[PDB]
Amino acid sequence: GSSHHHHHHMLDVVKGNLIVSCQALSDEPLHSSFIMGRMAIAAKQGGAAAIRAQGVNDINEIKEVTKLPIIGIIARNYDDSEIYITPTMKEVDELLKTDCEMIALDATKRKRPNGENVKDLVDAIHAKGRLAMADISTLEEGIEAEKLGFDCVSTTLSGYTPYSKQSNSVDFELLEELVKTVKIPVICEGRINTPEELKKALDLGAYSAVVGGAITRPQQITKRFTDIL
Amino acid sequence: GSSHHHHHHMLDVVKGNLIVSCQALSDEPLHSSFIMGRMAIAAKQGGAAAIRAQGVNDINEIKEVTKLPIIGIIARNYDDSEIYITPTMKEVDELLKTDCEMIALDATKRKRPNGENVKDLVDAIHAKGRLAMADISTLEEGIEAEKLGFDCVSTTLSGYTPYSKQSNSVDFELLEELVKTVKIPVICEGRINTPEELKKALDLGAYSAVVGGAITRPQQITKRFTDIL
Numbered sequence: 376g377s378s379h380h381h382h383h384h385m386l387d388v389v390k391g392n393l394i395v396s397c398q399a400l401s402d403e404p405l406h407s408s409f410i411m412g413r414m415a416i417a418a419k420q421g422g423a424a425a426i427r428a429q430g431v432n433d434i435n436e437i438k439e440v441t442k443l444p445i446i447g448i449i450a451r452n453y454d455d456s457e458i459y460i461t462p463t464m465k466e467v468d469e470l471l472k473t474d475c476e477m478i479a480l481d482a483t484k485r486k487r488p489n490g491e492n493v494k495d496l497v498d499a500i501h502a503k504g505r506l507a508m509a510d511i512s513t514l515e516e517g518i519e520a521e522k523l524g525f526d527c528v529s530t531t532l533s534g535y536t537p538y539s540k541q542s543n544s545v546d547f548e549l550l551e552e553l554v555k556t557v558k559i560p561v562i563c564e565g566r567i568n569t570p571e572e573l574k575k576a577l578d579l580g581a582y583s584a585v586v587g588g589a590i591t592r593p594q595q596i597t598k599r600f601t602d603i604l
Numbered sequence: 605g606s607s608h609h610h611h612h613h614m615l616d617v618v619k620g621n622l623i624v625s626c627q628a629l630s631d632e633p634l635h636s637s638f639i640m641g642r643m644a645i646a647a648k649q650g651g652a653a654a655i656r657a658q659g660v661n662d663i664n665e666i667k668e669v670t671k672l673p674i675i676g677i678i679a680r681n682y683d684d685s686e687i688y689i690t691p692t693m694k695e696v697d698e699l700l701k702t703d704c705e706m707i708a709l710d711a712t713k714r715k716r717p718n719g720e721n722v723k724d725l726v727d728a729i730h731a732k733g734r735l736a737m738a739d740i741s742t743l744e745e746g747i748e749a750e751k752l753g754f755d756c757v758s759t760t761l762s763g764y765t766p767y768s769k770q771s772n773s774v775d776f777e778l779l780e781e782l783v784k785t786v787k788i789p790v791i792c793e794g795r796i797n798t799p800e801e802l803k804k805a806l807d808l809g810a811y812s813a814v815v816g817g818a819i820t821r822p823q824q825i826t827k828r829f830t831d832i833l
């Protein structure tokens with residue numbers, strides 16, 4: 376098949392710019408597609424180049440009210456896997472019904488629900504002409520993600536798997552190691568709290584970066600204030 | 605008249621603690637009492653001791669969903685005054701129909717609408733058993749606020765009047781100078797962006813402090829990130 380050509384392409388749009396993650400799961404105070412939409416508007420008006428969002432309802436609302444490029448995920452627990460970021464083809468298919476341009480998925484070394492294989496997920500995303508982002512936790516996972524044909528890798532899961540670096544701050548070391556090894560874009564994502572950290576990520580060769588909670592989780596932002604008192 | 609005695613009193617509750625301002629005016633993406641209530645829940649869950657809020661509808665919603673103490677204001681422009689933070693008795697009366705425990709008002713040296721006198725507003729607040737906060741821009745304004753019977757003074761308007769220090773950062777000097785000179789509590793309010801600045805304000809003798817946009821205005825938080833790129 377064929378389609379009209381667009382002038383702007385998501386990876387070009389986000390290069391050197393900020394992607395804002397606008398998520399609020401069911402146990403979080405801002406949980407509401409309406410609210411996530413308004414948070415994405417705020418992000419757009421503060422200069423965000425793209426949005427990362429969770430679930431079909433939030434993705435569809437954000438797309439409608441901002442018209443920014445979106446990295447879509449579905450976060451879902453399965454009884455037979457530790458993976459929750461877009462774990463199976465079921466989630467991929469659900470996301471492919473939204474207009475999100477990129478789909479991010481856990482691309483860790485771990486077994487997926489139903490014993491599904493990450494390559495099948497990437498291929499399905501590509502079969503619909505969407506981009507795939509590999510959320511990884513280690514250097515080796517990043518290298519493998521490139522081999523599997525992901526369009527980009529993100530450091531999202533560093534510190535969120537038991538075998539990766541345990542840290543409460545941005546994993547710059549993983550970022551540094553990835554950029555000297557893989558050729559595809561490496562996106563810094565996880566625990567960026569300050570502009571100075573964002574700047575550092577880009578200075579170290581991150582293609583782009585994603586900030587979520589330091590912008591869109593006022594509970595977390597509040598806590599970082601109250602923790603100093 | 606008489607009333608039930610409470611164990612907790614607002615000034616004791618906020619002493620050494622953080623107050624979070626949850627505001628979104630009509631030109632802002634989060635303008636909605638629903639969203640401000642959710643911001644206030646987030647702030648509560650993150651350790652906030654009290655909330656500062658604007659407008660009856662937001663104040664009532666925040667009180668309903670958090671049960672925290674509230675510093676209420678009404679922001680309203682008048683054609684005959686530069687003052688917009690609770691400028692007249694009309695706004696005081698509107699706020700007294702809510703349960704907010706403290707009312708803040710501009711206590712600058714400037715003429716109010718209808719030639720009203722700030723002392724009359726303070727007295728009307730006290731007559732209903734509420735506390736009054738003086739939002740000021742200069743040291744002399746802070747010194748006069750105490751004389752006028754305010755219960756506390758805040759540095760809210762420093763940098764927001766033509767004759768006060770113009771700055772994009774917290775006015776620590778005004779804070780220190782008020783702490784040298786007035787006996788009533790001095791609240792640091794305005795342009796606190798980082799936990800380190802919050803700590804600094806308390807270390808300088810602020811009784812409490814208010815953080816607004818750095819928690820509850822994602823557009824502003826996002827811009828501070830994108831400005832460094």
Ligand SMILES: CC(=O)N[C@H](C=O)[C@@H](O)[C@H](O)[C@H](O)COP(=O)(O)O
Binds near residue numbers: 427565585587589
């Ligand atoms: C580990 C995991 O589930 N991360 C999720 C991925 O979408 C989100 O919870 C994060 O907010 C996002 O990755 C951005 O990170 P941060 O909020 O730290 O800036």
Ligand SMILES: CC(=O)N[C@H](C=O)[C@@H](O)[C@H](O)[C@H](O)COP(=O)(O)O
Binds near residue numbers: 625656764793795
């Ligand atoms: C000048 C003025 O109208 N200040 C208002 C006072 O309520 C609010 O816009 C501020 O957000 C609030 O004072 C807290 O300050 P900051 O958002 O800088 O932390």
Ligand SMILES: [Cl-]
Binds near residue numbers: 405592646
């Ligand atoms: Cl939150």
Ligand SMILES: [Cl-]
Binds near residue numbers: 632633820822823824
């Ligand atoms: Cl905002």
